[PDB]
TrEMBL record, chains A, D:
Residues of the full protein shown: 19 to 181 of 193
Keyword Signal: yes
UniProt name for this protein: Kunitz-type inihibitor
Entry's Gene Ontology molecular function annotations: endopeptidase inhibitor activity
Keywords for the protein's UniProt record, in alphabetical order: Signal
Origin superkingdom: Eukaryota
Length: 163, 223, 223, 163
């Protein structure tokens, strides 16, 4: 129900602005892309210590309101707003498991919500909309933290406008 | 509103703004004490603002009135977007004047091809953002339910309709949520959702108010 | 404000109201762009209202400016009520006039017996409720830290002071939070908390602004 | 951080108004006082089927703000605002356990918070303020539901303004 809010106390907008996801327990890391399996191009969404504050994200609902609430199903993406590249999804891939990855397509309703958790927010993934959600957390591998489903152990973020 | 025009003062007197420190949704004044808007616009302690054309300046013709009861439709379903309608009861009656008047409810549903007036203070660009100071307006036709289903397969229910242009260029947008779609002098629609704004083959989707009239009348009666 | 008087237009030009569809807290304008209030008044999308006397009606001298930044003190502790202060950078400068003017920060802390002006639109009754249309004012003295600790054992920190009357009858109250305590022409306090309002041996507790001046200055300089 | 809201969508007030706590799952029941052990006067807070809509409560914080957030420590009481009577506390007592009861003293800061839970609110008790909370649930006994610590199994309420 509640409005999602940035570090400056302002409502997080629907598509119009980009935001850094700043982790509270991994301060010197920021979002980036990395390679997973035998893939050539990096498509896994990671928190890279060697990258800060990282690549910013937009939060997108089809609803014609310019704020995001914690109950809205969202797309989450790197890059510009109107585009279909850099769109986050969750994909089963060894060695990570239910990995957060980027793709080139965008559903009308994305599978994520941003929900209040402790001193910031967590990203939650819904395999179908009616169901309960799975917290996005971190899988440590190759000196980086791959974002993946890890229910019970969310990665908690402050949402900072890129300005 | 993308590809619309400046309404003018007096031209959409039934339009209100839903506010809580900032404008976040449109709405329609349906009588002196009752506003209708979108369920997804629900927020605690909504203040309704009436008589505003320029939202950023205090024109004096305004009236600022708090919600006494915000009533989301009991079957409103955030997973499907179906039943996207809310009623707000104002704590005091709106005094009516040149810039504040009510819009009445349809006695029947509207047909395909009927030209409608859609209004709001939302984004005016299809790519990027630009928010207007004055209320904007757009005339858009109702599309047949079959083409609405074709545009958005899987998502259109009996309580939604599509309006606008499959060409793109003209549509409601983020910020217009809750606002009026008025056809033949009646409140037929509520700005709800769409895939982007003013994109080809992706028209606005609006709550079909005609299905809700018995609920609206009952809700007002009993409260 | 319990047991106070109607301030009048022009008399507290630094008083603002924190708003998000309704008045919920006071604030003090400390320059054209920055308001100080209490940390526990933190809310999303705060709008500040300046030049207001009658909070209900739209007098015309009112400026309505949104918060672009709302910075709670980084040591704010909701368990202990300690460090109860917030700065609000406004998105634009307030235009200054008879009804809108800043109050300056102290250069030193205030002494016991020093008389202060406390102001707000809070509850004017010590039991039950009555909320006033117009800004209310109260002259009240800073109490010694000894008598403040005796009134509230275990709860007063070095960032708090007491003001008012051990007899009761005269006090700040619910709705006054965030509002100014001005002693010797300086902003010495912020309305924070108390046990009931205007009760016997339960004076108002105020955030000690002299302790935060170097933080305020530092924060304004880097934002 | 979020403002607690009544069934009409309006912020819950700090002491000013009273509110019925209306359970979502036991619709035909309301707050009442009942006897616990070998006690003469009814001192336990119960949800009674033969008491509807129930005794209304006030939520009190010493903060001089006229609304309640989910982060505020509160006193909850039956009866009038300024009184020290009808004040809820949690007391270990057989056969109920950690029982919600009424008392005739009111601390500056009470031990409760009202937190969002499912489609309404739950009452959470804190033995001390710096610690994790304990959900208030229901101990079914003698055709009534004694309010008690029952962590994991909160009684979810709607907050309906008395008017
Ligand atoms: Cl809120
Ligand atoms: Na006894």
């Amino acid at each position: 129900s509640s409005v999602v809010v940035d570090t400056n106390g302002q409502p997080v907008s629907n598509g119009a602005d980009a935001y850094y996801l700043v982790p509270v327990s991994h301060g010197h890391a920021g979002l980036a892309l990395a390679k997973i399996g035998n893939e050539a191009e990096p498509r896994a969404v990671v928190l890279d210590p060697h990258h800060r504050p990282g690549l910013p994200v937009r939060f997108e609902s089809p609803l014609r309101i310019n704020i995001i609430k914690e109950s809205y199903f969202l797309n989450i993406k790197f890059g510009p707003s109107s585009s279909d590249s850099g769109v986050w999804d969750v994909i089963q891939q060894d060695p990570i498991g239910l990995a957060v990855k980027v793709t080139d397509t965008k559903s009308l309703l994305g599978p994520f919500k941003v929900e209040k958790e402790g001193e910031g927010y967590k990203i939650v993934y819904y395999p179908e909309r009616g169901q309960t959600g799975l917290d996005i957390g971190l899988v440590h591998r190759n000196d980086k933290y791959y974002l993946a489903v890890k229910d019970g152990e969310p990665c908690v973020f402050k949402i900072r406008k890129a300005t | 509103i993308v590809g619309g025009y400046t309404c003018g003062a007096n031209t959409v007197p039934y339009q209100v703004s839903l506010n809580s420190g900032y404008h976040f949704c449109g709405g329609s004044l349906i009588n002196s004490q009752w506003v209708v808007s979108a369920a997804h616009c629900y927020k605690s302690g909504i203040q309704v603002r009436l008589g505003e054309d320029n939202i950023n300046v205090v024109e004096g013709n305004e009236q600022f009135i708090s919600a006494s009861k915000s009533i989301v439709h009991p079957s409103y379903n955030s997973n499907t977007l179906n039943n996207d309608i809310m009623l707000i009861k104002l704590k005091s009656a709106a005094s009516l004047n040149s810039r504040v008047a009510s819009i009445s409810l349809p006695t029947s549903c509207a047909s395909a091809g009927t030209q409608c007036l859609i209004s709001g203070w939302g984004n005016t660009k299809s790519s990027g953002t630009s928010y207007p100071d004055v209320l904007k307006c757009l005339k858009a036709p109702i599309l047949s339910d079959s083409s609405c289903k074709s545009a958005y397969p899987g998502q259109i229910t009996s309580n939604m309709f599509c309006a606008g242009y499959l060409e793109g260029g003209k549509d409601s947008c983020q910020g217009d949520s809750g606002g009026p779609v008025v056809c033949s002098g009646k409140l037929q629609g509520i700005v709800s959702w769409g895939s982007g704004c003013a994109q080809k083959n992706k028209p606005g989707v609006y709550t079909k108010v005609c299905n809700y009239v018995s609920w609206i009348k009952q809700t007002i009666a009993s409260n």
